[PDB]
């Protein structure tokens, strides 16, 4: 009981500390900036060949190559300038839910309902593509995975834990615990020393990589958090939950800044992403269509319509020239 | 065509990749896929071992020129909502329930079987997916009703304490839970122990599902 009382005292300390710094909000100060006006986008390419639903994609760092995964039991590597297929890789278990692309261009990774993260090597002297590693040790499905470099990887699972793996050895190095529910996403920083993750207990946590302890907790959503992304500066991030809202949280000010919602929208969000200057926030939806928001005004409905099922994944290149979306109707499209 | 020679070699390679993908997709649609469900120790292991025997578990078998893949999922310790929509295109759901556990309150087991059956049937992802229902352990139930009738958990039951009356009452109790009687059916069986009847019943129910789907596709 004494520990509970002191915990309540500390919670009230955090609450009042957050309250003390609310000198002004974001909405009252940016109302003097010119808006984006109206933004119109057109489909430049259409990539065909996946048969079943599409669950994730990831851009390469040269802004020309792309990887995608479906429930067919196939990974595909595309050239997005000529819509050519560079590679097609068959999986061992077809219940895949995530994929990642190495920042050097030598490796890819994928995971699913079999609790194991597999890692593939693209550049051999035999011409084919081989499995270089299998990382096992979780007790629930895998939700995300993001390379740090050619030898260190991060994973999040649906048994309330995250892990940092050293690929060459094959064994975990550090483990992150503290969520009371399934972890659904993660997003690295530009300097790759911190990351964030959101869980099905409607909370997000900020983790430090080298030591291994939680640093910050962000609350406020009503239901689970389904997609997370990290602002290009490195000082803020934006979440999307299953109550038809997105929100912006600042790491330093340690409270919320702004909410993106509209009264005609009654479905959840499955993906968020940013633009290079930080003046557009793109969000996929269950309403079958993506949607573009002005990040500094929290108002627009500039839909990129054209899909016939729910939008499962989207992404923006490393220079800013294109936007790719993929959805449950098996077609992936490039907009410019 | 202003492509150089290397671009033409790239185009040839891409077309070959397309051909391979299409052929594999053709082959992946001539199969039957069943999702297996049960309850706590609902004797689901027996069903698995009888017919042709971390994370998902898959069983594969071949019968009368059909290829069945059965997915068992008991090792996932998370909620069903984060997990079920992946199985939206499945052909049928094979459900196991145990009869002898009518007097085993853990509030007995029949109530849990009813609750989970009602949760599965009325799901929005399974608006046209049919169910194959297995009732297990008829023997031990038959001896146990020699001493304790069904009134111990069904006070409103108004029949004699014999075998077939109780069996039919339980079967109708479980099949009345349907709320989509016009779209999907429910098949029932009393688990044999001596021969391949447990497999022939699945074969027949799947053939019926296939025929009805073919007719309903043509709008006929």
């Amino acid at each position: 009981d004494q520990l509970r009382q002191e915990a309540e005292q500390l919670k009230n300390q955090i609450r009042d500390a957050r309250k003390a710094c609310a000198d002004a909000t974001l909405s009252q100060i940016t109302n003097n900036i010119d808006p984006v006006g109206r933004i119109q986008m057109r489909t430049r390419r259409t990539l065909r060949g996946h048969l079943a639903k599409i669950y994730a994609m990831h851009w390469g760092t040269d802004s020309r190559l792309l990887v995608s995964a479906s429930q067919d039991g196939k990974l595909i590597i595309w050239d997005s300038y000529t819509t050519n297929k560079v590679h097609a890789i068959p999986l061992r278990s077809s219940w895949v839910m995530t994929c990642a692309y190495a920042p050097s261009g030598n490796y890819v990774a994928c995971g699913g309902l079999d609790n194991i993260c597999s890692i593939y090597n693209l550049k051999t002297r035999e011409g084919n593509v081989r499995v270089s590693r299998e990382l096992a040790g979780h007790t629930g499905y895998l939700s995300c995975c993001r390379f740090l470099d050619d030898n260190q990887i991060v994973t999040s699972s649906g048994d309330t834990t995250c892990a940092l793996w050293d690929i060459e050895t094959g064994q975990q190095t550090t483990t992150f615990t503290g969520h009371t529910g399934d972890v659904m996403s993660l997003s690295l920083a530009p300097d790759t020393r911190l990351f964030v993750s959101g869980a099905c207990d409607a909370s997000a946590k900020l983790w430090d990589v080298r030591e291994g302890m939680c640093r910050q907790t962000f609350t406020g959503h009503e239901s689970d958090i389904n997609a997370i992304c990290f602002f290009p500066n490195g000082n803020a991030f934006a979440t999307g939950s299953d109550d038809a809202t997105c929100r912006l949280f600042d790491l330093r000010a340690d409270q919320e800044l702004m909410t993106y919602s509209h009264d005609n929208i009654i479905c959840g969000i499955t993906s968020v992403s940013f633009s290079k200057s930080g003046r557009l926030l793109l969000a996929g939806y269950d309403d079958f269509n993506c949607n573009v928001w002005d990040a500094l005004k929290a108002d627009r409905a500039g839909v990129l319509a054209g899909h016939d099922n729910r939008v499962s994944c989207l992404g923006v290149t490393d220079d800013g020239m294109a936007v790719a979306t993929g959805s449950w109707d098996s077609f992936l499209k490039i907009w410019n | 065509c202003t492509l150089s020679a290397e671009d033409k070699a790239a185009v040839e390679r891409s077309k070959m990749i397309d051909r391979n993908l299409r052929e594999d997709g053709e082959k992946a649609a001539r199969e039957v896929k069943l999702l297996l469900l049960g309850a706590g120790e609902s004797g689901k292991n027996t069903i698995v071992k009888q017919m042709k025997i971390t994370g998902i578990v898959e069983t594969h078998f071949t019968f009368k020129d059909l290829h069945f893949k059965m997915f068992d999922v008991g090792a996932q310790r998370s909620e069903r909502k984060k997990w079920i929509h992946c199985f939206e295109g499945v052909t049928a759901i094979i459900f196991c329930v145990a009869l002898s556990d009518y007097d085993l309150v853990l509030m007995n087991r029949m109530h849990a079987s009813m609750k989970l059956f009602d949760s599965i049937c009325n799901n929005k992802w399974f608006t046209d997916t049919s169910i194959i229902l297995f009732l297990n352990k008829k023997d031990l139930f038959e001896e146990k009703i020699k001493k304790s009738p069904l009134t111990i958990c069904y006070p409103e039951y108004a029949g004699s304490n014999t075998y077939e009356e109780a069996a039919a009452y339980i079967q109708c109790q479980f099949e009345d839970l349907n709320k989509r009687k016009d779209t999907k059916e429910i098949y029932t069986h009393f688990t044999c122990s001596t021969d391949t009847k447990n497999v022939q019943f699945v074969f027949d129910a799947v053939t019926d599902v296939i025929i009805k789907n073919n007719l309903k596709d043509c709008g006929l």
């Epitope: 020309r64 190559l65 050239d79 050519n84 560079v86 590679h87 002297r125 035999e126 011409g127 084919n128 | 202003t2 150089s4 020679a5 290397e6 671009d7 033409k8 070699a9 790239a10 040839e12 390679r13 070959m16």
Partner: single-chain antibody, 228 residues
Framework: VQLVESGGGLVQPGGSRKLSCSAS????????MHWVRQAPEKGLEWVAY????????YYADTVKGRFTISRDDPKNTLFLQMTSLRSEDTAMYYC??????????????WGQGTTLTVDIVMTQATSSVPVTPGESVSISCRSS???????????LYWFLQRPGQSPQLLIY???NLASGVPDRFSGSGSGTAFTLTISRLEAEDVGVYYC?????????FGAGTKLE
């Protein structure tokens, strides 16, 4: 990785011949294959090309209608068939490997050759260059047409051949450097005129250098520059 070919020898006027090449240690069914030729006293000369899937065949204009190329995938073996051989056919024959997708390195593994005994132009400005170890050198060759395509490429290749050995890729597409090659070589230039450069010469870097184009078929070689 290994390619071993055989079938060479001595032949009379007329007649016919068949040379075969066995691949081992790689996915021979995903690679396009070339046959290349070298005279006993001259430079190299391209001969024939068959692609992955056997849907494309190219010949040289001095051999078309007399030569035939074929592959056999389940056994991983490549064949050339020559008909009615004359005096000009005497040479060494090399089997070469190449794979084309976005960002690959063609012409990187060569066979070892066999002895058989019976258009854009590139010009090598020299024939022999005497130098001493520790110095840097530069080799140059010239073209007759611009090699810079509209998509941004530049189909220029630099190859090396040491005494008594098969050649070896050094530089593909005029600026890129192959894997397994010490990073003291370089190459540059601009349309129709190109120059390779070597820094800090050492032993076992003595022999003949070649510059090649691949902008269109046929493919054409140079005279060869001899460094000693």
């Amino acid at each position: 990785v290994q390619l071993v070919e055989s079938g060479g020898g001595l032949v009379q006027p007329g007649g016919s011949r068949k040379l075969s090449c066995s691949a081992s240690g790689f996915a021979f069914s995903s690679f396009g294959m070339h046959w290349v030729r070298q005279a006993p006293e001259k430079g190299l000369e391209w001969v024939a090309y068959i692609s992955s899937g056997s849907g494309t065949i190219y010949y040289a204009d001095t051999v078309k209608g007399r030569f035939t190329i074929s592959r056999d995938d389940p056994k991983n073996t490549l064949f050339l068939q020559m008909t009615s051989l004359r005096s000009e056919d005497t040479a060494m024959y090399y089997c070469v490997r190449s794979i084309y997708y976005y960002g690959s390195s063609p012409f990187d593994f060569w066979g070892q050759g066999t002895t058989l005994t019976v258009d854009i132009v590139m010009t090598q400005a020299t024939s022999s260059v005497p130098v001493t170890p520790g110095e840097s050198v530069s080799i140059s060759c010239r073209s007759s047409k611009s090699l810079l395509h509209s998509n941004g490429n530049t189909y220029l290749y630099w190859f090396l051949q040491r005494p008594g050995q098969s050649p070896q890729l050094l530089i593909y597409r005029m600026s890129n450097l192959a894997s397994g090659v010490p990073d003291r070589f370089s190459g540059s230039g601009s349309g129709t005129a190109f120059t390779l450069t070597i820094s800090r010469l050492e032993a076992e870097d003595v022999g003949v250098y070649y510059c090649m184009q691949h902008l269109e078929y046929p493919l054409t070689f140079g005279a060869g520059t001899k460094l000693e």
